[PDB]
Design a protein around this ligand. Sequence first.
Ligand code: CLA
Ligand code: CLA
Ligand code: CLA
Ligand code: CLA
Ligand code: CLA
Ligand SMILES: C=Cc1c(C)c2cc3nc(c4c5[nH]c(cc6nc(cc1[nH]2)C(C)=C6CC)c(C)c5C(=O)[C@@H]4C(=O)OC)[C@@H](CCC(=O)OC/C=C(\C)CCC[C@H](C)CCC[C@H](C)CCCC(C)C)[C@@H]3C
Ligand SMILES: CC1=CCCC(C)(C)C1/C=C/C(C)=C/C=C/C(C)=C/C=C/C=C(C)/C=C/C=C(C)/C=C/C1=C(C)CCCC1(C)C
Ligand SMILES: CC1=CCCC(C)(C)C1/C=C/C(C)=C/C=C/C(C)=C/C=C/C=C(C)/C=C/C=C(C)/C=C/C1=C(C)CCCC1(C)C
Ligand SMILES: CC1=CCCC(C)(C)C1/C=C/C(C)=C/C=C/C(C)=C/C=C/C=C(C)/C=C/C=C(C)/C=C/C1=C(C)CCCC1(C)C
Lengths: 36, 334, 34, 442, 137, 341, 81
Amino acid sequence: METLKITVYIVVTFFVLLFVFGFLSGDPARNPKRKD
Amino acid sequence: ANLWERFCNWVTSTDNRLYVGWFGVIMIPTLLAATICFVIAFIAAPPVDIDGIREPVSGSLLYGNNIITGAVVPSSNAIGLHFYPIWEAASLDEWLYNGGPYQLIIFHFLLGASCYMGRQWELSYRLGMRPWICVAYSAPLASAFAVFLIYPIGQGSFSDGMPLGISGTFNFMIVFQAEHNILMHPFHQLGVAGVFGGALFCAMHGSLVTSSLIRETTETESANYGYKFGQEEETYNIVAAHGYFGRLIFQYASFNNSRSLHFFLAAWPVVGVWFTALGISTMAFNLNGFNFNHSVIDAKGNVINTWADIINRANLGMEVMHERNAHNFPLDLA
Amino acid sequence: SYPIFTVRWVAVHTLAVPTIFFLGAIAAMQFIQR
Amino acid sequence: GFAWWAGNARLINLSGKLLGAHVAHAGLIVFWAGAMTLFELAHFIPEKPMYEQGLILIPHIATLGWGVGPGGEVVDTFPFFVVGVVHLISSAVLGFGGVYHAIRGPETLEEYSSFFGYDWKDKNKMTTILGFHLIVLGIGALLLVAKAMFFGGLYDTWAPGGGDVRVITNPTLDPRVIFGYLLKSPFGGEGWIVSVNNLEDVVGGHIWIGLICIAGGIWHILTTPFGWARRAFIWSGEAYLSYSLGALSMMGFIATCFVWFNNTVYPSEFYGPTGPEASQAQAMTFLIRDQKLGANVGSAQGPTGLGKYLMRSPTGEIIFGGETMRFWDFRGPWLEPLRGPNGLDLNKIKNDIQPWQERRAAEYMTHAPLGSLNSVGGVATEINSVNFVSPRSWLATSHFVLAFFFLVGHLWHAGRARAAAAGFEKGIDRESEPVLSMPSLD
Amino acid sequence: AELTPEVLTVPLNSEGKTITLTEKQYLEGKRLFQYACASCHVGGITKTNPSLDLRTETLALATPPRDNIEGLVDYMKNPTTYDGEQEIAEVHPSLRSADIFPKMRNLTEKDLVAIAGHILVEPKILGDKWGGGKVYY
Amino acid sequence: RGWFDILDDWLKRDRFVFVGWSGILLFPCAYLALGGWLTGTTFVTSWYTHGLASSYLEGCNFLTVAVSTPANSMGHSLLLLWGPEAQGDFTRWCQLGGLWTFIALHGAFGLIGFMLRQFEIARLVGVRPYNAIAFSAPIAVFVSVFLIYPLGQSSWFFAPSFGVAAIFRFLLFFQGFHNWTLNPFHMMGVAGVLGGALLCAIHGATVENTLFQDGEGASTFRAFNPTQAEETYSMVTANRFWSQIFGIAFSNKRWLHFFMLFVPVTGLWMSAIGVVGLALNLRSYDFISQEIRAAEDPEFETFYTKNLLLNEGIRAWMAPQDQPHENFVFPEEVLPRGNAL
Amino acid sequence: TTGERPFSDIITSVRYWVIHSITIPALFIAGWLFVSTGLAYDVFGTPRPDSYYAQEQRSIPLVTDRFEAKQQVETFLEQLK
Ligand code: CLA
Ligand code: CLA
Ligand code: CLA
Ligand code: CLA
Ligand code: CLA
Ligand SMILES: C=Cc1c(C)c2cc3nc(c4c5[nH]c(cc6nc(cc1[nH]2)C(C)=C6CC)c(C)c5C(=O)[C@@H]4C(=O)OC)[C@@H](CCC(=O)OC/C=C(\C)CCC[C@H](C)CCC[C@H](C)CCCC(C)C)[C@@H]3C
Ligand SMILES: CC1=CCCC(C)(C)C1/C=C/C(C)=C/C=C/C(C)=C/C=C/C=C(C)/C=C/C=C(C)/C=C/C1=C(C)CCCC1(C)C
Ligand SMILES: CC1=CCCC(C)(C)C1/C=C/C(C)=C/C=C/C(C)=C/C=C/C=C(C)/C=C/C=C(C)/C=C/C1=C(C)CCCC1(C)C
Ligand SMILES: CC1=CCCC(C)(C)C1/C=C/C(C)=C/C=C/C(C)=C/C=C/C=C(C)/C=C/C=C(C)/C=C/C1=C(C)CCCC1(C)C
């Protein structure tokens, strides 16, 4: 169970960081008109 | 050309058949976890002691249910609002008996569904659209939060959140009526108005546009072949539809502006469903429907019944029968 | 040069005349005691 | 470009008229705080609990230690009156400044003075205004610490003896406790910050928050946003309003749960019992009643096989039985005398229940926060007779609703700000429709 | 049907003397019963001890008899258990305990009579609803 | 240029409210249905038919006021004013439930008139008559619920009464007695109404958020012109959006707006059919396989069995007051009740 | 657009309000009187607060015959005289 807990904590942290840093990577600029 | 930047480009690419996006990055795993657990539980989960009284309710197909009676059963009243992930159970067998799977599914779904709404904003931004389609979906989303999260929080138990099944749904709405007189609550009445009105204006708008299609076809072909995807000309005559509908009522009760008309179509069912989600969300704190029981008495003081008193007799029969073994004291305070 | 009495005039007063009367009767009712 | 029904969007770049709008609206807030208090005091009857009287503001004042003595017995009404008057009077000064600035003052500020004028896109001016307000907020949090420690203390429902105003001499500074709350689970038995249950921790947290806010206020006056922050946010008035709508919405949901669950900074003496409290109080009541009749409440098996009066929680603690098994995380001062380390203690239950505890449980049971919209107390099938809806239901429901709509307002304004910033909030350019320059999906 | 003097006529004591309330006393008593007593005795039941109600026949079999103005006014001053064996002022509202039950502080002697009158009149009007509970709602 | 033509000229004149030949059926009947309901709910009781108060005059409010059905003892009597029941006494007619039949019948003939008006105006204007067709769905619901359902039962008494809370009572009745939520025809109606409401909202929002920029202002309404040839929103961008978000999208504006007609109309038609079944007490009340297993196996419990306990509660607890002509006396000891409650 | 007089032009007109500041109150008062006189009770058969039951009665006077129903309610109303 503790192995399952660890695994889920890891997978979740992974996806949540993708999300945080993805939006930190200049998201306003990724549109079709005015990029900044 | 860098690794992270190429990944970011694929995540946000407008060229994927299905858009991913950063909301997609959370949505996809959580909706896969909730979907997969739901399907397996619906087919083969063993009975769950929803009410904490060691009386398990059989919800799955292999335990003698059909599509209409089956459900993922809410987790145990003994758990209340405690978090019950798998790794907090001594074993899967325990987690199953106590209704673990409901928690897993509703938390993953509500997350993924919140990200669904955000994904709607996102792709709207990548395509140069206006952004508020997601605001329309917030109405259904708020409704799902009310019956899966808010009402449990206020009543203190996920055992009182809505079951994931067809008859479980009906069970939830019958018990709600006995405990909150939801029919006599104005916010539910606005939900009905939002939903009846929504279906009405759906039919109206569809019949008016359909009534004013411009002849582009022959009687041996579907009229639908008169419109070509991406054509610049509008495909019906709006002045003809205005001319018919304004004479069916009077001129000034009819829309000649297609923008106002379509904004009306959007706002009526959305606002009505906001209110009904707000209904469930505030009855969660026991601010219940109007109570006119014995409100009419005669000159001597005999009670003169009204239709509200008749509703009460039906609510009483719901009250006294539901969860028939779970109450030991005279008032059902949650 | 407008007409005063129309089909329109009739439908309006069809509804408005007894609406008020009705409102008056319902106002009077708030003061009934048992 | 805006219509009458979006007419306040005409103020976006009129910093002077927009000042008046804000300060006039601030006056409305202070007016209602003052007027509502005087209404409540004019209707107040001291011999009736506050929560039988539809009062939501007197309870906030009483909680600060004014007007009340031991038991929450109301001792002196004058503090209430003072609080109402000073607010009501203060709203005329804000009304005055608001109408002046909205109607007669300079439409725009940045020509009259370079200090009060602002451009939304001026990141340094905006972090500076942010900083000043952070300091103010920090000062405000410290005002509460001052009341608690130096000007008479606060009402303490847990004070030994039934509750009383107590001066807080040892606020909790240990950051393991203060920040510990911020890391507890929001789920049952944990309760995130809603579980704070003593005034030492309340006061200590406000010390931390006051310093943090003063510190950040100075930080933001002195800095400009770093580049990663410049590239991740939209910098416009609407964008900033959207950020705050989001923050207010989250705060409204928290407040909802605070007033529904917490009986420390919302003492049940003033606000009525919580849902869980009331439900625990019913099992207490019939346990008392039945034990006086001779029942052995410990050995009594109920219909299900579970104890009729007492059972175990899933971690074994002895708890009240029946449906209230869900509410065993409840803690209240009338109940704790009965708890040992295994949970409720059978020998204290048999031997040590006091009349004041019997009274309190009957009172709370019969004042559960259940009621109709037209203020008929009790379960929804109850007959008319009792005019009563708990202040906690009124405060929880209202703030859930406002929290919800501010979330809708956040989505509304955040989407709009993004689209206006990119230049397509008004629609798609027919001669440059992005999709028409993209490859087909299939 | 109306609030006639015959219905407003209730026993004063066990001796058998009787007293006729006014409409005013009756509505006075109803109001005061909602203020001070209905939180537990709505409709003539007792929410915190459903085994004891306010029906006239129950009061009659109480020790001392409480089916009369005197017995009821006394009860509101110095409440006892149903067999009369112990005083329960500590846990039941009473003038004897208005310190812990503040709502009793401003009840006057005539208030007590109007309250006791209401209790004895209401079964005559409502019948088995009075003290019968949800079955009769 | 005979007189029939002269009147046709006059009926079909363009005026603030069009009249038409259909107006002769429609307008008297619509006004009389509506007038009867305002009259009964303000002034008229249900004491002698139902044992209920039901007017503002009696102290009811807008939720509890109703024009209640006639007494069960009237069977399916038309209850004409001049009929053998009221014998021409207006006052007795009101006390016997005469306004119910008045409202239901004039209502039914108004509905016809209204649908004939949709036909008449559509023929005069030169559009196709799909709005009349769609309106067949409300008609189907009205006739099946207010007419067919009680005609299969013992009397009009058991139809819906014309009132907010009386209708709520009707909903609850159908749960306890018919287990109506279990009925697949109701379920298809639910999907039709809810799917209608969804379509309404999603189509409105899509149009408003794929608008072309046709004006300079922030209020986008001003930049439509009812006579422009051009579509005012981008079907193309709308289609890519929904294809990428949901997997499928509309590509055909005609199909879309027909589907918007199709969904709620069909749903209502399905529910109508199920209520026809309940006219005969032909319910989907039970699942036989569940009952056989549960009778034999006291540990077997599902949401289906839990809901029938509630129906059982409902019936025993509401029947005596809701059917006073049956003189049901249920002593306390026979009422079904769980523990404590 | 059809030839009747615009509404906005009628309800701001001085002539309009000269009539309707009489006709509206008269109707509001006519309706009042309909109730305050008691006439509404008699026209409709609606029980007054004192006349739902006889004094020691708790029976609803429920109609139970179709063709004798008129005579039944007439009987129940004499049981109150
Ligand atoms: C909190 C509420 C609030 C506030 C504070 C404001 C404030 C403002 N609005 Mg907005 N507005 C609101 C709600 C609000 N509005 C609502 C609900 C709507 C929807 C109908 C609008 C629609 C709207 C439009 C359409 C426009 C504004 C405009 C304006 C600004 C100029 C108004 C002006 O010159 O009026 C002139 C009005 C008067 C001279 C009449 C008297 C008004 C006074 C202030 C009444 C107060 C009386 C009070 C009792 C006095 C106390 C005195 C004492 C304290 C000394 C002003 C800053 C305008 C703008 O942006 O200008 C560029 C504009 O065009 N508003
Ligand atoms: C946050 C709100 C706010 C803001 C930003 C401003 C900002 C401004 N005002 Mg406005 N004003 C406000 C509120 C506000 N005012 C209120 C509430 C009133 C009514 C009292 C006025 C009445 C007013 C007038 C009559 C005039 C202005 C003018 C001005 C400008 C010049 C200010 C100056 O040099 O003052 C000089 C600064 C001082 C004398 C220092 C003041 C110290 C204050 C009073 C103490 C603050 C303590 C504390 C924060 C207050 C809380 C106490 C309370 C809780 C009990 C400037 C743009 C002038 C202008 O632009 O005209 C063209 C002008 O003529 N204001
Ligand atoms: C009203 C409050 C407020 C506001 C609006 C801002 C606004 C801002 N701050 Mg300032 N700040 C404040 C208070 C505030 N600050 C205070 C009091 C302090 C002192 C502690 C600081 C210290 C501070 C520093 C040191 C810095 C800023 C920076 C910034 C900018 C970037 C913010 C950002 O990216 O956050 C977005 C946050 C993230 C991307 C990471 C946050 C992740 C957390 C863990 C999420 C938790 C949410 C969760 C659901 C709720 C539970 C909480 C949890 C702890 C339990 C922005 C202008 C930056 C800047 O440019 O400065 C010039 C910067 O470096 N702020
Ligand atoms: C801090 C809060 C805040 C602020 C400052 C703004 C500011 C603004 N909003 Mg946002 N908004 C907010 C909260 C806020 N909003 C919330 C919570 C929502 C969610 C519903 C929205 C949703 C929203 C929309 C949909 C739109 C705006 C728009 C706007 C702009 C013009 C609004 C206007 O003139 O309305 C004028 C005021 C009215 C037309 C009257 C509104 C009346 C409400 C609906 C009735 C409430 C009745 C009350 C509860 C009960 C009645 C009781 C009875 C006795 C009277 C302006 C920039 C517009 C925009 O985008 O411009 C850029 C716009 O289109 N707002
Ligand atoms: C076209 C409009 C219209 C329609 C369709 C109806 C339809 C109906 N009304 Mg309504 N009614 C209307 C207008 C209408 N009414 C108006 C304007 C009023 C106000 C006066 C009323 C007042 C009213 C009342 C008070 C009642 C009805 C009732 C009825 C129902 C029974 C009708 C019946 O049996 O007719 C029978 C008669 C006919 C069908 C006429 C046939 C005509 C033939 C073809 C010609 C015969 C000519 C003659 C014999 C020749 C001369 C003879 C010699 C002496 C010279 C039915 C649902 C009753 C009801 O609802 O029951 C509950 C009821 O009590 N109506
Ligand atoms: C309860 C819900 C509900 C109501 C109130 C309602 C109402 C209406 N729908 C109409 C139309 C439509 N409805 C449509 C689809 C639908 N309509 C639906 C549901 C409803 N539709 C649903 C769900 C759909 C989806 C399929 C279409 C497609 C149309 C139209 O074309 C038409 C329209 O123009 O709408 C814009 C109008 C017909 C006007 C008319 O006949 O005037 C004449 C009035 C008459 C004949 C009097 C009728 C008397 C009634 C039957 C009996 C008496 C009722 C009492 C007076 C009131 C009782 C109130 C208590 C019950 C509380 C009217 C506004
Ligand atoms: C700016 C604007 C333009 C467009 C229209 C819109 C109306 C929305 C708008 C907004 C206007 C706004 C919000 C106006 C703000 C005005 C405000 C807040 C007015 C406040 C006035 C307060 C005043 C006098 C208070 C008077 C106080 C007095 C004597 C106190 C006397 C009393 C005392 C001292 C002891 C107790 C008894 C009693 C009698 C109450
Ligand atoms: C004061 C008090 C009294 C009672 C007791 C108690 C001890 C609890 C006490 C103390 C309370 C304390 C100290 C509270 C502390 C609260 C704190 C630190 C709040 C934390 C706030 C942080 C939040 C939201 C951050 C939100 C972050 C968001 C938007 C990020 C958004 C973004 C992301 C994720 C990616 C890039 C784009 C963008 C938009 C920037
Ligand atoms: C509450 C509210 C919130 C939103 C804003 C708003 C201001 C609208 C508002 C207020 C609206 C109010 C309260 C509206 C009330 C309107 C009412 C009471 C109007 C009543 C109109 C009644 C009318 C025609 C009655 C017509 C009666 C007729 C034919 C009866 C005919 C006949 C009958 C029934 C029997 C046979 C004989 C005969 C003569 C043929």
